[PDB]
Design a protein around this nucleic acid. Structure first.
Lengths: 50, 148, 69, 98
RNA sequence: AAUCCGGUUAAUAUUCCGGAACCAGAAGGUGGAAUCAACACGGCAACGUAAAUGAAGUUGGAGACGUCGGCGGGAGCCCUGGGAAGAGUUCUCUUUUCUUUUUAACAAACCACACCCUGAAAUCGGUUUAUCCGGAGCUAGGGUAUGGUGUUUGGAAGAGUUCAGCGGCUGAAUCCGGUGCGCUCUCGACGGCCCUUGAAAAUCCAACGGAAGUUGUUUUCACAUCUGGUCGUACUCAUAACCGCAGCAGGUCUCCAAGGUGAACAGCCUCUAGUUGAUAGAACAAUGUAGAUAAGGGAAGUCGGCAAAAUGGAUCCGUAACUUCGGGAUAAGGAUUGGCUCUAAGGGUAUCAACUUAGAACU
């Protein structure tokens, strides 16, 4: 809700930052085996459960 | 192409609903260029965005039928859907009656019936007698005249 | 806001250091309102007479900032 | 007492409506006390110059009603599209094009 | 404890902007007030006044309270008579149909069930819609208190709104009233109900008490002066943002609530606002789902009147057995209902305001 605790907003802020696509220059590195973010989340599909 | 953002801005600026917002359909290119509230205000100033008048809700028929109903129209047994108590409560009728009788009653006392007559004609007025102001008047006229 | 019914009170409050600015408001009924912005209140004097209006306006201290409608 | 003007200087310049239509239509359809033809001394139309329509009424009688009656015969003469009634001053109306 | 209005963004506002306030805390300063008759006066009184020292201790109040029912007041809304601006309509009719007519917190002044004073009341009076009150002082008369969501002004018209021009600017208007068994909220004074009597505390104020105490003392008085941290604040709150595996016909607390019909927050229709979303197109075969109707008969159908039909509002008349006397009861049975033109009553100060019943014709 609008009424949040500071602890909740911190966890939500980190969840937002982790819910981003991968930088493109990561994909060009030597020995790179990472192509797409395998930990992506959508707000309807998976819930954060905090 | 898309003018949904422009319509929401226009409704907010014009202080009306998006149903009341009108955009000149021949100025889509310039309206689409307008992307801020300053731009929308300029469009409203230029006349390219107009707040349309409300829909018509005239009370002419309502006023006419209420003018008919005060003369005694549309008030028969085929028009009464509520009970007599529902359409006019007897509690209101008697409360109005008691106030009318008592106001006239003390008016005559201050004018010059006395305390004894006012006290008799009051318990009697509370006792369902004096069905209207005129009936109380005639009782007052016959009272103290048969005595004098 | 405060209403002042005395002209010399208006001058005295204007003389007081808390006065910051003054507004002269000319209404459509030829009645002027002399408003004085202080630290705590907007002091307003309603002068309905024209001749008392401008003698008061020239009576206001020169250091005070007087502003048109 | 109260005094009203309906300016039609543009109309008389362009032969849009003439004085005769103005005067007769006003006289015929001024609803004084719910009736026409009872103007009397209370409401008198006394035009000055061939550009005015002056109405002097001794009773409450609204300029909106003047604007009402004006718009009536502009519709009758079927050029309401190119002519509209606009108020300029207190109790004075006049005719405007597009 | 204490914030309002207008404005502002693509997205934030009681938070920003403009304007206007308010609260708490702190220090001393200025002006006034008390005091060598130390800690003010007036009023018969209720109590009033800009002030008007009050420690420890004690005590009191506020905070702080159910539910129902009508009654009265206010506010907004609804409604309404004129004026003014535009707009719709105009074969004809309509001095009309519609829209716009706005005023916040805050600040000041103003404003009558309880109480007081004189006076003593039975031929008892006063009085509410509702029967309570009075020799424990009625009525009456004169006072005191309580005092806004009231009035008047400041805020504040410069704002907002509506219109007419000009190339941001210039002109106008933003007016004067009514009404009520109306609606929502609220307030007041009451009535009913209980083997039910319907929180606490933080905070705040007061009293009793009398410690201390020419300058000096005090001063809950009017003024200026400074300050106000931390976190929440977007958006959804649901026939797509929540939970049901989902953009699921399910579920999920609550606030605001226009007009007509009508008893009604019913149903039906409309104004503001919102939406026009749910694979579409063309065809009308059987069967089906969902609605309708049917001659004559009228439960013969069926385990069973299952489903359907029938009845239905209001007014008037009439109403059995039985009964725990309260009911049964809308028992059962009858009649009546439109439109229109009229009168007849029912209120307020010659005149105004308001739907509510009784008829009478005519159709």
């Amino acid at each position: 809700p609008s009424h949040k605790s500071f602890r909740t907003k911190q966890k939500l802020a980190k969840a937002a930052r982790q819910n981003r696509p991968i930088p493109q220059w990561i994909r060009l590195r030597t020995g790179n085996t990472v192509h797409y973010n395998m930990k992506r989340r959508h707000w309807r599909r998976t819930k954060l459960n905090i | 192409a898309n003018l949904r953002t422009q319509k929401r801005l226009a409704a907010s600026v014009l202080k009306c609903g998006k149903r009341k917002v009108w955009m000149d359909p021949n100025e889509i290119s310039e309206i689409s260029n307008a992307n801020s509230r300053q731009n929308v205000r300029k469009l409203i100033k230029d006349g390219l965005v107009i707040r349309k008048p409300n829909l018509m809700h005239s009370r002419f028929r309502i006023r006419k039928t209420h003018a008919a109903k005060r003369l005694g129209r549309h008030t028969g047994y085929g028009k009464r859907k509520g009970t007599a108590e529902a359409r006019m409560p007897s509690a209101v009728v008697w409360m109005r009656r008691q106030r009318v009788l008592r106001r006239l009653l003390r008016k005559y006392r201050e004018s010059g019936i006395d305390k004894h007559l006012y006290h008799t004609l009051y318990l009697e007025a509370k006792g369902n007698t004096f069905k209207h102001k005129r009936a109380l008047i005639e009782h007052i006229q016959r009272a103290k005249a048969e005595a004098n | 806001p405060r209403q002042i019914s005395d002209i010399k009170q208006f001058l005295e409050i204007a003389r007081r250091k808390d006065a910051t600015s003054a507004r002269i408001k000319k209404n459509t009924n030829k009645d002027v309102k002399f408003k004085l912005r202080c630290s705590k209140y907007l002091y307003t004097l309603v002068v309905a007479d024209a001749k008392k209006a401008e003698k008061l306006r020239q009576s206001l201290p020169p250091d005070l900032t007087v502003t048109e409608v | 007492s109260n005094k009203y003007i309906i300016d039609a200087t543009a109309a008389v310049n362009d032969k849009i409506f003439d004085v005769a239509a103005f005067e007769k239509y006003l006289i015929d359809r001024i609803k004084v006390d719910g009736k026409t033809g009872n103007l009397g001394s209370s409401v008198v139309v006394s035009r000055e110059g061939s550009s005015k329509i002056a109405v002097i009424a001794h009773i409450d009688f609204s300029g909106r009603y003047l604007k009402y009656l004006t718009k009536k015969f502009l519709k009758k003469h079927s050029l309401r599209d190119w002519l509209r009634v606009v108020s300029t001053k207190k109790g004075v109306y006049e005719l405007r094009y597009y």
